[PDB]
Every structure is written in structure tokens, then in C-alpha cells.
Ligand binder design. Structure first.
Ligand code: HEM
Ligand code: HEM
Ligand code: HEM
Ligand SMILES: [Fe+2]
Ligand SMILES: [Fe+2]
Ligand SMILES: [Fe+2]
Ligand SMILES: [Fe+2]
Ligand SMILES: [Fe+2]
Ligand SMILES: [Fe+2]
Lengths: 161, 161, 161, 161, 157, 162
């Protein structure tokens, strides 16, 4: 087996994207936890781990076709300081990823490579779920009031580690 | 073994400081608990116990060098009535302690007494953690709003004992 | 409720006394343990803990009447080198305390404040028991012989942590 | 608290180095596992996890001093095809790291910041252990014979997930 | 890795000292146990085992720097007949060891080798504890009375 | 009772020999373990512990006769680099010990001291078994091939405590 060049290019793009996402999510997890906001920290940690698993699967697949994984690149990382900005950054990233996934699935399945298409389909479902949750939380913050919102996710524990 | 005079002087200063801190923390624990604020009471109580253990370790050490522990002194104790004032008092105390610890560690380790230096290093780490937590809580109170902050740490139980 | 000034004065004096006692007992516990006499260390440590509990109860009561606890003042602390001197110091302290307790209970119960009177009565019973035990041990030391007495409370641990 | 600029610079450099190491180790884990050499895969995977933990600790510390972690930069990643080349790459990386650690510990502890010095000391111990193991395995491969060496770490699983 | 010569010299001296201490402590354990004083035999055995562990750690460290451990040389061993003499011998040994440890830690940490300095720091803490206990027991023997002291550690079994 | 002088001399010599053996075996255990060879390390550690127990028994006996144990003297310690040299050193030591044990047992039992003779007999049995195992392993190394031999006792831990 030898996957064509274009399939490998798409797989590499998606791999780099998932890596960037891992980095962003972990940085945000630490930043949030340090300030007192706890449950947000727990949620964001879980999401980072999920993106890790994604990266693993893509790496294996791109190995099995006689490819050269690219663990040397990275797209721009964004960082915020309030809550609204964090959520907006994450929403932007997920949108871009979804568009790429769709285009890639089309081109792939038009060339008789089915397994890669299935991998992309799974990734796509998950990214859609995630963007949905982000949008919901953003709408709440808009409605209640930033102080009100924050006042529900603070507990008494040790900030630093 | 006979630790030099200056080492003993520094150990005695630190001992007196830890004693003062114990007293302040327990008074604040009672005052907070009596008004309804519960979780604050639990936290402050635990912190007082920790400072107790600190004092014990310092006493044992200063005994092992043929010294004369000083259980007769006390630095000025501060007391507030609101929350912000309590937190600010505690922050002031911790700052003073940290500065003393650093100067003492330097002078000690410049005279071939290593064990005392290690004791001071441990104490220093812990005091740093504590000051960090204090600053975080103070920032929250500044942001949310005093009443809207308190409204998260009140339960239905027996005030007095 | 607002307890009169005189009731609060008596409560404050008793509080300061129990604090001084806590300090003295703990210092003696360390000093005894460091020399090898363990079985005395255990007893004295337990007694210190009991006096701690005393202080806590008194503080709560003096809070419930709209008072101002006084955690800033200490009486004189005594320290002895041999054993007989330790026991004699403790006996002196307990005697002073008992006299104060009796006078206070009388004046209180002559003014329609019954709960404080009950608190004092409990404290009085306990401090009397303690003075009794002290006197007994002192009589033994007088009879047997100092060295022949010590020879019964030494074990093979000889610590100083 | 506000750590000086130079302390933060050293912490940031060490953080970037640990990140690069994580990436290299995991790529090597996958590459080895895919070819049949199992036990080497297990070992290298565990080492990657350890470096992950290192990175986390450094990030927290650099946060506590009011710093700006740098999750956006990577050094050069090396990849080899045979086994000897893998081991040699890892050895090179560890050497660079050790030199940096020593210089940094000196400069730090010459400026009254002790906790960062302790962090570096722990990291240094661990990196030394690791370089030792690498050198040992390389010497064996040199002695036995490459094929006769590999023949000891192959099992009947031959997966690639 | 290539540890300098002077670091290795200090490590070797400390190793030889710990070995001598092991030998002395075990001989004393047997001698005491044989006469009836059991409760002292137990303590002394435990201390010998601790010194064994010390020796092991030092040997490994001096191996990791490309060194040549020296398991061929011993210092002088002392032996006493009564009890006070045993305690005094042990006290002397520990004092000497402590002085060496301090000087070595200084010179080491002045040359960027940190892990060895940490090893020495741990050893130093432990030796200090031990010398303390020795001094305490000696003071008791001085106070109570030799026979009246012994009479508390004999056992019919 | 008081054992004669010559009995005590023989007991002291044997004690010194067992001490030297303890030292050699532990040094070899560390050296082997540090290079990767594991199972050899485990075996050699066990052997060192056995020699320790030997020394303990001998010292107790020499005390019970009103003697003066000699914890101050050591014979020469040998050290190698490869495997063959290690095994050959150990074989040499055991041979010497055997000869001494036999001569001593004879002289002892010719003087009405039976318990010491029994002690020596036990020690002798054990030393014989040990020398046997050494010779067997040496013959294997001769037959298979040094590298092809080592390739069977290496695992993926490669430690060196500190
Ligand atoms: C900056 C910090 C971290 C980075 C850059 C990072 C990155 C990675 C990468 C690149 C992988 C391999 C991708 C793959 O196998 O497909 C991975 C796997 C993994 N990492 Fe990390 N990681 C970080 C922190 C952590 C931490 C602190 C933990 C603590 C447990 C952790 C746990 C894991 C796990 C469990 C996996 C494998 C998940 C699975 O097998 O399903 N990661 N991570
Ligand atoms: C100079 C003043 C004091 C000193 C030196 C002191 C010392 C100590 C020490 C060393 C302990 C050790 C407990 C442990 O190791 O677990 C202790 C326990 C304790 N302290 Fe104090 N203390 C002081 C005053 C107080 C005060 C003012 C209070 C009450 C507000 C208090 C309440 C307690 C209690 C209740 C315990 C035991 C907790 C339990 O048994 O659950 N102490 N103290
Ligand atoms: C370099 C390391 C060691 C050395 C030099 C050493 C040396 C010795 C010596 C000289 C004796 C008894 C000597 C006599 O009876 O006069 C002995 C006995 C003993 N030591 Fe060690 N030892 C070492 C390691 C250890 C370790 C690590 C342990 C425990 C984990 C240990 C436990 C014992 C035991 C159990 C005995 C008695 C053996 C038996 O009853 O058969 N030794 N050792
Ligand atoms: Fe993803
Ligand atoms: Fe403290
Ligand atoms: Fe009392
Ligand atoms: Fe690392
Ligand atoms: Fe030692
Ligand atoms: Fe033997």
C-alpha cells in the first residue's frame, strides 16, 4: 500500500491542527485554574485530553500508508485574559477545522480511499459537538451577566500547584 | 554541638513570629464562624493548625543545639471586622515573614550550618503558597462584589458552640 | 443579650490564665521528652491539650455576650531545670487559678447570669483533679528518691525531633 | 511577588526544551512500535509521559511569579531510521539540557530565589539518570551485535494502532 | 559524564568511614547481647543496618561518575569492655565523620556538582541525630548510676 | 570452659576469610548490575547474603569459648572487568577456603572439641556446592560464546540507583 500524495497532505494538515489545539487547551486550563475558577478548569482539561487522543489516531493512520508525520510545525496560538475572549478563540479554531474536514472528506472518498474517509467522519462528528457546547456557554454569559456567571464556578481549594 | 549565637537569634525570631500567627488565625476562625460564614471558618481553622506544626518543628530544632526557646514574647496582633480587612492583615503578616526567612537563610548557609538552612527553605515554600491564595481571594472579592461574594459561603447550621 | 462589664472582665482574666498554662505545659513537654523521660512527656502533652480545649470554650462564651476576647496578653511563664521544680511551678499556677474561679463564681451567680456560673463550675472541678495528681507525684518523689524515681520512666527511644 | 526578568527567561528556555523533548520521544515511540520492537516502545512511551509531567510543573511555577508562559516556540526535532541513531539523538538532547540546568541554578541561587533553584535541582537529578541509561544501552548494542540485540525485544503482536 | 578527581576522593573517604562504622557497630551488638543486656543489642543492630544502607548509596553514586570504589581499606576499629567506653567510642567516631562531611559539602558545591552535595546533606542530618542520642544516654548513665542503669535492660528469655 | 589457643586461631582465620568473601561478592554484584546484566546481579546478591550469615555464626561460636574476634584484618580483594575474570576470581577464593576447612577439621576433632568440628563440616558442604556451580557456568561460557551467552541475561530496566 502507498497512499497518494494528496491524501497524505490532508492528513498532515489535520495533524498539525490537532496539535495546535492541544497546546491552546492546556494553556487555558492552567490559566483558568490559577484564578479560582475551578469547574471550568476541569472541563477544559478533559477537552485537551480528547484532542490528544485525536492526534494519536491520525499519527498512526498516516504511518500505515508509508508517510512522514510532521511533528515540527505549529499554527498560531491565541490567548485571552477574560472569559468571553477564551470562548471566542476556541470557537474560531473549531470553525476552521470543520471546514477543512469537509473538503478533505470529499476529495478523499472521490479516490477510493475509504478508511481515511471514515476517520475524518468520526473527527467531524466530535468537533461539531464541541462547537455546539461552546456556543451555548457563550449565550449564557451574554444573558445572565459576567459576575453572576462567574459566581457559580468558584470553590474553596488551593489555586497554585 | 553548639550552634553559634546568631543562628539561635534567627531561630528565636522566627519562632515568635509563628506563635503570633497561630493566635491571629484562630481568633479569626472563631470570629468568622460566629457570623454565619462557614467554609471560611473551616479553611482558616486548617491554616491555624498548619502554623502550629511549624512552631513545633522550630522548637525541637532550637532545642537540639543547646538553646533557650522563648515562649514568653509576642508581636502585635491585628484584628478586623469585615472580610477585606481580615485578608489584608493576613497578607501583611506573611510578607514580613518571607523577608525575614530569606535574609536568615543567606546568613546561615554562609556559616556551615546546613540543617537549619533546610528547615528555613521548607518554611519558605509553604509561606509563599499561602500568600498566593490570599491574593487570589482578595482579587475575587474585588471583582464580584462583597455581598454577592459572601452569598456563596453561607449554610444552615449552629453559629455558637 | 449584653453581659455586664464585670462578667466580661472575669471571663477575660480566666482566658488569659488558661492561655499561659497552655504555653507552659507544652514547653515542659518538649523539655522532658528531650532528656529521655518519655512517660512523663506523654502525660504532660495530654494535659496541655486539655487546657487548649478549656481556652476554646471560654472564648466562644465570651463571644456570645457581645465581648472582645483578648488574645494579646500573657502572664509570667515559669520554667525549671530539674523535675521537682517543674512540679512545683505547675502546682503554684493551679492554686492561683482555683482561687480566682471561686471568687468569680460567687460574684457571677449573685447577678442572675447562670450559664457562665456553670462554665466556671466545670472548669473548677477539672483544675482541682489536676492539682491533686500533682501533689501525689511530688510526695512519691519525696519518698522513694529522685534517681530511683526517674529510673521507672525511661525507655529506649531517646528522640528529639 | 514578582520574579526578576532573568529568572523568567531561564524558566522559559527550560520549558521550551522540555516541550521539544516530549514531541521527539513520542514520535520515536510510535516509529519503534510500528516495526515490531515492542519493549523499546513501552520504555520510550513511559519516558515521554515523564517529560510531560516535567513541563506541567515548570508551567505552574512560571505562572506563580506573574510571568507569561511561552507555548508557541519549539527547538529542532531530530529523527533517525535505525536504532543507534535514535539513541544518539536522545543522548545529544539530554546533554544540552544538563548544561543549561547547571548554569541556571548557579545564577538563580545567587539572587535569593530558592524555590526555583530547588525545582531545577530535581529536574537535574532526573535528567542525569536518563542519560546514564541511554549510554548503557548504547554500549550493549555496540558489544553484542545489532541483529543479535534486536532479537531479544520482539513479540507476537506486530500491531500498529 | 566525568566527575573530577577531588569529588571522587571525598566520596571514597566517606565510603571507607561508613564501612569501618558498620564493622564496629556489629561487633558491639554481639558483645552486648552475649552478656544479657538485650534491649541495647536490638538498638545497636538497627544502627548497624542503617550504616549498611548508607554505604550502599555512596557506592552506587561513586560508580555513576566513572570511579573506582575502594572496598579494600579500613580505618582503626575501637572496642571497649564496659558500657561507658562503648558509648564514648561511638561518639568519637560520629564527631569525626561530621567534620569531614561539612568540609566536603562546601568544596563540592563550589564546583557545580550538586547531586553529590545533596547526598552529603542527607548523610549529615542522620549522623547529627545519632550523636544526639548517644550523648543523651551517656548523661543518664552519669546521673542514675551504672548498676541501677543496667538493671533496666536485662531480660529472662 | 576455655577452648585451647589453636582452635581459636583456626576459627579466626576462617572468620577473616568469610569477611573478605562478603566484600568481594557485594562489589561484584554492584558492578554487574550497573552494566545491564541483571539475573547475574540477583544471584550474586543472594550469595553475598549467605556468606554474611556464615560470618555471624562463626563469630558467635568464637565468643562462646572466651575468645577475641578479629574484625580488623582483611585478605586481598580481587576485581575483574569481563565475566570470565569474575568467575575465575571467585573459583580461586573458594578453592583456598576448602583446603583450610579440611585441615582445620582434622586437627580440631583430634582434640575432643566436637561442636567446632560440626560447624566446619556444615561450612564445608556449602562451599563445595558453590564451587560446583561456578565451574558449571564457566564451562557454558566456554561452549556457547561470550556474546551469545550474555544475550540471555539482559532485561529492560538498566538501572543505577544513584
Ligand atoms: C504541554 C503538555 C502536553 C503535551 C504537549 C502533550 C501532548 C501529547 C501528545 C503529542 C501525545 C501523543 C499523541 C498520540 O498518541 O496520538 C499525548 C498523549 C497522551 N498524553 Fe500528553 N501532552 C501534554 C500533557 C499531558 C499530561 C500532563 C498528561 C497527564 C496524564 C498527559 C497524558 C497523556 C495521555 C494519557 C496520552 C495518551 C492518550 C491515549 O492513549 O488515549 N498529557 N500527549
Ligand atoms: C500559644 C498558643 C498555642 C500553642 C503554642 C498551641 C500549640 C498547639 C500544638 C503544638 C498543637 C498540636 C496539634 C497536633 O499536632 O495535631 C495544638 C493543637 C490544638 N490547638 Fe493549640 N496552641 C495554642 C493555642 C490554641 C488556641 C488559642 C486554640 C483555640 C482557638 C487552640 C486549639 C487547639 C486544638 C483544639 C488543638 C487540638 C485539635 C484536635 O484535637 O482536634 N490552641 N496546639
Ligand atoms: C554493602 C552492603 C552490605 C554490607 C557490607 C553488609 C555487611 C554485613 C555484615 C558485615 C554482616 C554481619 C557481620 C557479623 O556478623 O559480624 C551482615 C549481616 C546482615 N546484614 Fe548486611 N551487609 C550489606 C547489605 C545489607 C542489606 C542491604 C541488608 C538488608 C536489606 C542487610 C541485612 C543483613 C542481614 C539480614 C544480616 C544477617 C544475615 C543472616 O542472618 O544470615 N545487609 N551484613
Ligand atoms: Fe480534534
Ligand atoms: Fe508558618
Ligand atoms: Fe484549665
Ligand atoms: Fe525533562
Ligand atoms: Fe553513616
Ligand atoms: Fe562461606
Amino acid at each position: 500500500m502507498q497512499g497518494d500524495p494528496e491524501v497524505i497532505e490532508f492528513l498532515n494538515e489535520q495533524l498539525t491542527a490537532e496539535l495546535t489545539a492541544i497546546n491552546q487547551y492546556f494553556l487555558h486550563a492552567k490559566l483558568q485554574d490559577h484564578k479560582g475558577w475551578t469547574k471550568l478548569a476541569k472541563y477544559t482539561r478533559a477537552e485537551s485530553f480528547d484532542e490528544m487522543r485525536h492526534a494519536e489516531v491520525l499519527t498512526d493512520r498516516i504511518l500505515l500508508l508509508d508517510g512522514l508525520p510532521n511533528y515540527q510545525r505549529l499554527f498560531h496560538v491565541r490567548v485571552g485574559q477574560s472569559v468571553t475572549e477564551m470562548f471566542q478563540a476556541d470557537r474560531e479554531v473549531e470553525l476552521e477545522a470543520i471546514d477543512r474536514l469537509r473538503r478533505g472528506i470529499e476529495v478523499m472518498r472521490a479516490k477510493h480511499d475509504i478508511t481515511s474517509a471514515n476517520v475524518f467522519e468520526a473527527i467531524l462528528a466530535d468537533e461539531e459537538h464541541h462547537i455546539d457546547y461552546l456556543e451555548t456557554q457563550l449565550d449564557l454569559i451574554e444573558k445572565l451577566g459576567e459576575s453572576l456567571y462567574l459566581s457559580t464556578v468558584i470553590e474553596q481549594t488551593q489555586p497554585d500547584p
